[PDB]
Scaffold this active site. Structure first.
Site, mmCIF file in Angstrom:
data_model
loop_
_atom_site.group_PDB
_atom_site.id
_atom_site.type_symbol
_atom_site.label_atom_id
_atom_site.label_comp_id
_atom_site.label_asym_id
_atom_site.label_seq_id
_atom_site.Cartn_x
_atom_site.Cartn_y
_atom_site.Cartn_z
ATOM 1 N N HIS B 166 0.813 -1.204 0.000
ATOM 2 C CA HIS B 166 0.000 0.000 0.000
ATOM 3 C C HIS B 166 0.850 1.260 0.000
ATOM 4 C CE1 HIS B 166 0.300 1.644 4.164
ATOM 5 N NE2 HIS B 166 0.661 0.409 4.457
ATOM 6 N N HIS B 167 2.160 1.135 0.184
ATOM 7 C CA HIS B 167 3.056 2.266 0.002
ATOM 8 C C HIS B 167 3.767 2.322 -1.336
ATOM 9 C CE1 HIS B 167 2.978 4.105 4.018
ATOM 10 N NE2 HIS B 167 3.198 2.928 4.574
#
Ligand SMILES: [Zn+2]
Ligand SMILES: [Zn+2]
Lengths: 613, 651, 185
Positions: B166-167
């Site tokens: 998710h980063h």
């Protein structure tokens, strides 16, 4: 021979719902007769007759004597008791048919609490949300749920102590409420159309402020649908706004439902549009609410298809299948519904903690009734405004009061220059309360006084006409005052206008050129008086600073040239974001209410002077 | 006897199937390289240890049938095994560029020290020699879970998957991710099924910002991106403006991005309950997705040292329940974070039980009354999203600059309240208006009980103008003025004291209009206090046991009367209901033991959310921190403790 | 007993439905027979007026026929007799169809009249039997009571010989506020 149209409380309701499940593989009993080997998803429970002890726990002895005695009465006596019960029909076989619902109810509830089934369903008739402990009423003979609930509480004081009883039956649960109206351990709620005498039952017990009594205060609830035709919108709306916070606040050991699908979509005694998916999603929320403890009792439903489809959806939700998808997620519920739910959450904040500091209600406590005495710390504010202006105008222009006698309004409602009966020209400012622009604190609801920007715009025309030596009539119709909970500004305004025109203004010797100014929504009462009386003899024109308000539909009751004379002699400035023959010369003003007043005063006052010549 | 309805099979779709499970022992070797002994005393940011701890907790509850705790196919009766395979470079390049694939390709064939410099160089990442295949397996497992759910092979799936995704940004990686797992899987499903999977709704509760997943769909309308996290822009990772709540999309994806930022840590159950009750469900039903992807992260759990929150594993089940209500039954769960293995174990256990079908339990605390900052934060979010979506218009009075010259024309409202006030006071208590001659002030600045020159005990209650609670209408915008109340706050004490036959003195001091802090009020307070003390108090013969009562501000007058006079011989207690105001330091001039008598004979009640305790001095004089906020609440609350200290202070 | 019970209850249901049906069909043919009677009234006024034509024109025939000097009025007269006879034929066929409608109404009415009392009788005897059904159920209830009391007693800690001698939680162990309801100091 009324068999064309049989009784809505009907035997098929049991049999139809029982049929529907067997059509969906839920029941593997082909002959539709009560057997034990139903199938694998559910578990049949026997139904037994309730004893006299259980049924006399809530009911009185005379009631049981009557129902036991009518079990072997003659035919015409049964006819007399049928016509004597308030929509309750009696017949030769009536003792056991009424003692089996209560027994079946206690059976299903004991099955739920002893952990033998996950939950239970009881397809049952006759209903029990209209039977009172001393008299029968509303197709009901014995209050089933009261008997059952009092058995659960008295016979299980080691695992269950608080219970929730829900009534989404569109008729208010009259009988089930009074039995526990003084009771605190049970929180009762009823979603129902109320409609104040119109809908069934239409009694004061159905009002939304019947919140219990004695120690039972705040442990009783009526949700009162004002208008018929509510759907999935208002149901899910009320569920999220009132039901679920106070539900997770009260935290029951058991949730009981006195359900009725007489409010389901396609029903006739209800006339509502609750789809069975809304039923399934509300059922989902209630499943989320408790730890799983649930029992449902059937009370309403008088349309076999509506109750049958609703029952099939709820049964799928009950076995474990999640809720389906609603017909429309973009529906934007009715304003009146929101205001009614707001007034509900108000008193609930007055009692419970979960509706203040998250709903800007922690500022003032409403448990003090708002008074001018010292009994309550609260004090009304419009009274202070009016008292200040009264003191002001009285020492300033010697503004005398006009006693609005035989009407329930304060002495300083109407303020007037002295010797108004001899004013050659009478200006009548039917004005409205001022407005502020500030930032309301979201945590408490309280506001600031150091940056409060209130302007008394309704005083400009007073001083203007005062310089003209014109008689000034200031009338103050407030906006609901927050105190009485039933004050109606429009109707009261119409009465004051009728009253003053027929009692005082029609008698004045030197009355001439009566003008009329209405600011904001407070102009619609003028429309009534104009439409209902011939006043244009002395009346010259009529002025309105509508602001952003909707137009007021003029319907005349005395002539038709009222519309012509009105539309000729009316200037109605409106919002620039408004865009909207009988409306009377809609003017879409430029700047924006205070804006158009200080801007179009000059247009207003000049047209007044030209029409006055 | 007549068979009317012949026996049939049940007509259901949810739960004849099992819950999908993606697990593999081939994703626990992407590990860091030892650098310093500081690594032995730190929580190991993304550790491979997350997998087997949860996987161990699973077998202890019978939901899966595996006493050996290794990869098998017979997963029992409630769950179904979903095999993982390395995602080809095509699915990876659906989001990323071509230099990042070659970056991770080169990374595979490096020595030890160049990988060390890459661990040191990266934006909070670490590389390894086994970081190429172990990065291709997450995206592949994610695509397999989504295919299993979409094609109905399972009722839902859950995927125990690491490293996170998710980063990772389309440009390059940063944030302990290598390949963005959520975006890859979402774009491959929208590319693989654009007839059934046409609207996807991605949600993030991980306490960092899902920056890469944000950028991946920031111009996408089929993908509703929602992220709930802490912003704290200065320090808190990622520290990017993409984490700010105003990133509401761009282009066709406007209103199809949402960041929800927590102004401060410490959040619990009631906050997330209230939030998920109000905002995500209307826009989710209005957006009507055909698939809801869950970016699970348990790095904000109760017992986590990085999130520092106190969220219990029941609220997780409630949120899982609501999300299951949201979609059509299709649900996928990918795991992103977590630091404390026991908290993530119990949380994942609860989530997986709710996913199999068990109902959520009741929350351990339904009553927290959420912190004030997040309230107006979500108000601003509602403003933006009301501008974009319709379910926040017409219900919250949003519907998608007062003046500066009319200020000369204003209705006064201080003297009106004080006048009405004076009126109802005199009509029930017959107060004497006391004239402060040689001082230009309102005549009703001070009202005292009659025959004040003979009462020994004299209670002097100073306070500003009263509070007002008003109702704002919800139908259209602004506030309703006629439906407002006057919160008289100093009324219980005046009545209370008159029931004990004390000298009672009311003092009002108005507020400086259009002024942040009532400094002129403080000056006027010192004037009234000093002047009243000199001109009046010293001339009354019978006086003993004075007690003061301060409400909010104006206590500078009392502070000045203490420091600049010597009056402690006859008064015996000072009491302020500060509330939220700033502290008034005592400036002693006559002597120093007056200050300790001050500090000693004092009781001050200030709020929980006040500036302090987040440690004041003794020159403020022994303040106390309340549990509630608001002046009315704390006065009605501690009205009894105050009269107890007063009666204890006197005879 | 519940087999026979549910057969009789479905029978009673079908009966009430049928009473609705017959009174419904009768109530609809009421307005039909009413309109039919009105057209019959019209047709009878038609007969009367055609007979007035027949009478006056036959008078005129008698006026013209003796020692003739024959005008054309008698042919028109005879033609009016033919029209009156044909119209009489039409109204006669019509009053027959009218009578058919009326007698179907009457027989339906009679069936509807006896159906109610039939329903009431079935109801009466249904109550008579259902009484004894309920009491027999209560006897079987106390028998169940007896059996479970005995079985529950002999099942647990039992008498001195072993010649004959959890899930689901029957022994009051459903963990929803039971142990935590106790004081436990
Ligand atoms: Zn009802
Ligand atoms: Zn994470």
């Amino acid at each position: 021979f009324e068999y064309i149209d049989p009784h809505p409380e009907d035997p098929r309701r049991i049999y139809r719902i029982y049929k529907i499940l067997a059509e969906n593989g839920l029941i593997n009993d082909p002959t539709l007769s009560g057997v034990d080997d139903l199938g694998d998803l559910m578990l049949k429970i026997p139904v037994r007759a309730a004893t006299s002890e259980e049924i006399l726990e809530v009911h009185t002895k005379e009631h049981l004597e009557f129902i036991e005695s009518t079990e072997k009465m003659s035919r015409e006596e049964l006819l007399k008791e049928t016509e004597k019960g308030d929509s309750v029909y009696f017949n030769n076989d009536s003792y056991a048919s009424a003692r089996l619902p209560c027994g079946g109810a206690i059976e299903a509830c004991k099955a739920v609490v002893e952990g033998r089934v996950k939950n239970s369903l009881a397809v049952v008739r006759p209903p029990g949300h209209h039977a009172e402990p001393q008299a029968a009423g509303g197709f009901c003979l014995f209050s089933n749920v009261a008997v059952a609930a009092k058995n659960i509480l008295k016979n299980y004081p080691e695992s269950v102590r608080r219970i929730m009883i829900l009534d989404w039956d569109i008729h208010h649960g009259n009988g089930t409420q009074k039995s526990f109206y003084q009771d605190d351990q049970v929180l009762y709620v009823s979603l129902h159309r109320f409609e104040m005498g119109k809908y069934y039952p239409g009694t004061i017990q159905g009002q939304y402020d019947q919140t219990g009594e004695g120690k039972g205060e705040g442990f009783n609830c009526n949700i009162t649908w004002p208008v018929g035709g509510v759907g999935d919108a208002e149901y899910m709306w009320a569920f999220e706004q009132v039901v679920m916070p106070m539900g997770r606040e009260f935290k029951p050991d058991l949730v009981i439902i006195s359900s009725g699908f007489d409010a389901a979509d396609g029903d006739t005694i209800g006339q509502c549009h609750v789809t069975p998916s809304c039923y399934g999603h509300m059922t989902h929320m209630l499943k989320s609410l408790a730890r799983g403890n649930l029992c449902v009792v059937l009370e309403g439903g008088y349309n076999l298809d509506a109750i049958a489809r609703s029952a099939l959806s709820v049964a799928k939700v009950l076995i474990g299948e999640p809720p389906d998808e609603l017909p429309d997620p973009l529906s934007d519920p009715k304003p009146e519904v929101i205001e009614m739910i707001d007034k509900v959450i108000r008193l609930q904040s007055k009692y419970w903690n979960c509706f203040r500091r998250r709903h800007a209600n922690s500022g003032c406590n409403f448990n003090e009734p708002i008074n001018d005495s010292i009994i309550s710390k609260n004090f009304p504010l419009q009274k202070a405004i009016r008292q200040q202006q009264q003191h002001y105008l009285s020492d300033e222009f010697n503004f005398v009061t006009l006693p609005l006698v035989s009407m329930d309004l304060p002495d300083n409602t109407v303020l007037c220059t002295p010797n108004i009966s001899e004013s050659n020209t009478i200006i009548i400012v039917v004005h409205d309360t001022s407005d502020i622009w500030a930032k309301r604190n979201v945590i408490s609801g309280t506001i600031d006084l150091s940056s409060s920007v209130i302007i008394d715009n309704s005083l400009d025309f007073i001083k203007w006409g005062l310089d003209r030596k014109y008689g000034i009539i200031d009338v103050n119709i407030p906006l609901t005052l927050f105190e009485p909970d039933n004050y109606s500004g429009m109707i009261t305004s119409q009465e004051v206008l009728i009253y003053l025109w027929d009692n005082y203004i029609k008698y004045f010797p030197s009355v001439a050129k009566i003008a009329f100014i209405g600011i904001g929504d407070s102009y619609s009462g003028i429309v009534h008086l104009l439409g209902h009386r011939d006043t244009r003899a002395v009346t010259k024109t009529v002025i309105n600073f509508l602001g952003d308000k909707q137009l007021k539909p003029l319907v005349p009751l005395v002539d038709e040239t009222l519309s012509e004379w009105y539309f000729k002699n009316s200037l109605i400035f409106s919002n620039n974001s408004h865009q909207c023959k009988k409306f009377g010369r809609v003017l879409r003003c430029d700047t924006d209410l205070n804006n158009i007043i200080e801007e179009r005063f000059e247009e207003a006052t000049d047209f007044i002077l030209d029409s006055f010549e | 006897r007549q068979v009317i309805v012949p026996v049939c099979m049940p007509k259901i779709h949810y739960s004849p199937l099992k819950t999908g499970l993606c697990y593999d022992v081939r994703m626990r070797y992407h590990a860091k390289i030892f650098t310093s002994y500081f690594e032995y005393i730190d929580p190991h940011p993304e550790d491979p240890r997350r997998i087997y701890r949860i996987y161990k907790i699973l077998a202890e509850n019978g939901l899966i049938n595996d006493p050996t705790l290794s990869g098998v196919d017979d997963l029992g009766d409630l769950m179904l095994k979903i095999p993982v395979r390395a995602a080809t470079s095509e699915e990876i390049l659906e989001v990323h560029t071509k230099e990042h694939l070659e970056f991770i390709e080169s990374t595979e064939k490096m020595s030890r020290e160049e990988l060390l410099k890459e661990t040191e160089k990266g934006d909070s990442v670490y590389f390894n020699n086994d970081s190429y295949a172990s990065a291709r397996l997450p995206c592949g497992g994610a695509i397999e879970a989504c295919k299993a759910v979409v094609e109905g092979r399972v009722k839902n799936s859950l995927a125990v998957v690491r490293p996170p995704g998710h980063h990772a940004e389309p440009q390059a990686a940063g944030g302990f991710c290598l390949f963005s797992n959520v975006a890859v899987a979402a774009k491959n499903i929208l590319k693989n099924y654009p007839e059934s999977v046409r609207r996807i709704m991605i949600l993030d509760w991980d306490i960092h910002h899902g920056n890469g997943t944000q950028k991946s769909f920031y111009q996408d309308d089929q993908v509703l991106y929602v992220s709930l996290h802490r912003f704290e822009m200065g320090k808190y990772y990622p520290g990017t403006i993409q984490g700010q709540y105003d990133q509401t999309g761009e282009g066709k994806g406007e209103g199809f991005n949402c960041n929800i930022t927590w102004p401060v840590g410490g959040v619990g159950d009631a906050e997330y309950m209230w939030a998920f009750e109000q905002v995500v469900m209307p826009m989710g039903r209005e957006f009507k997705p055909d698939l809801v992807i869950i970016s699970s992260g348990f790095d904000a759990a109760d017992g986590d040292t990085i999130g520092q929150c106190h969220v219990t594993p029941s609220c997780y089940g409630h949120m899982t329940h609501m999300l299951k209500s949201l979609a059509r039954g299709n649900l996928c769960v990918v795991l992103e974070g977590g630091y404390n293995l026991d908290a993530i174990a119990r949380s994942a256990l609860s989530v997986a039980k709710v996913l199999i079908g068990e109902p959520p339990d009741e929350l351990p605390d339904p009553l927290s009354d959420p912190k004030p900052e997040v309230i107006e934060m979500i108000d601003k979010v509602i403003r933006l999203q009301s501008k974009y979506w319709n379910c926040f218009r017409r219900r919250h009075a949003n519907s998608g600059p007062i003046n500066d010259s009319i200020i000369s024309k204003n209705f006064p409202l201080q003297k009106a309240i004080r006048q009405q006030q004076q009126h109802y006071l005199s009509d029930e208590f017959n107060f004497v208006t006391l004239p402060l001659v040689s001082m230009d002030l309102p005549d009703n600045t001070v009202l005292c009980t009659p025959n004040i020159s003979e009462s020994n005990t004299i209670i002097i209650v100073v306070h500003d103008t009263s509070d007002i609670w008003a109702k704002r209408n919800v139908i259209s915008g602004t506030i309703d003025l006629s439906s407002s109340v006057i919160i008289d706050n100093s009324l219980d004490f005046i009545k209370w004291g008159l029931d004990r036959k004390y000298g009672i003195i009311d003092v009002n001091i108005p507020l400086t209009l259009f002024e942040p802090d009532n400094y002129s009020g403080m000056i006027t307070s010192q004037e009234v206090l000093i002047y009243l003390w000199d001109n009046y108090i010293k001339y009354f013969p019978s006086v003993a046991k004075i007690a003061f009562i301060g409400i909010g501000d104006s206590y500078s007058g009392i502070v000045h009367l203490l420091g600049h006079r010597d009056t402690r011989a006859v008064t015996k207690t000072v009491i302020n209901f500060l509330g939220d105001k700033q502290l008034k330091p005592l400036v002693p001039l006559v002597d120093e033991t007056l200050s300790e008598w001050y500090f000693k004979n004092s009781l001050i009640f200030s709020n929980n959310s006040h500036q302090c305790w987040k440690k004041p001095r003794k020159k403020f004089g022994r303040v106390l921190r309340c549990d509630t906020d608001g002046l009315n609440n704390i006065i009605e609350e501690r009205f009894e403790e105050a009269t107890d200290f007063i009666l204890d202070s006197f005879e | 007993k519940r087999l026979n019970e549910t057969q009789r209850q479905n029978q009673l249901d079908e009966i009430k439905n049928s009473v609705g049906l017959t009174f419904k069909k009768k109530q609809e043919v009421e307005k039909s027979i009413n309109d039919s009677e009105k057209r019959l009234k019209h047709a009878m006024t038609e007969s009367t007026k055609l007979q007035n034509k027949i009478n006056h024109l036959l008078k005129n025939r008698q006026e013209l026929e003796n020692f003739n000097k024959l005008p054309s009025n008698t042919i028109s007269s005879e033609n009016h007799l033919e029209e009156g006879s044909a119209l009489a034929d039409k109204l006669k066929e019509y009053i027959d169809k009218n009578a058919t409608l009326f007698n179907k109404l009457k027989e339906l009415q009679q069936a509807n009249a006896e159906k109610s009392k039939l329903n009431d009788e079935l109801r009466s005897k249904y109550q008579i039997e259902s009484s004894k059904a309920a009491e027999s159920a209560q006897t079987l209830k106390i028998l169940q009571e007896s059996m479970k009391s005995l079985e529950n007693e002999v099942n647990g800690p039992l008498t001195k010989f072993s010649t004959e001698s959890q899930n689901d939680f029957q022994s009051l162990k459903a963990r929803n506020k039971f142990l935590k309801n106790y004081i436990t100091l």
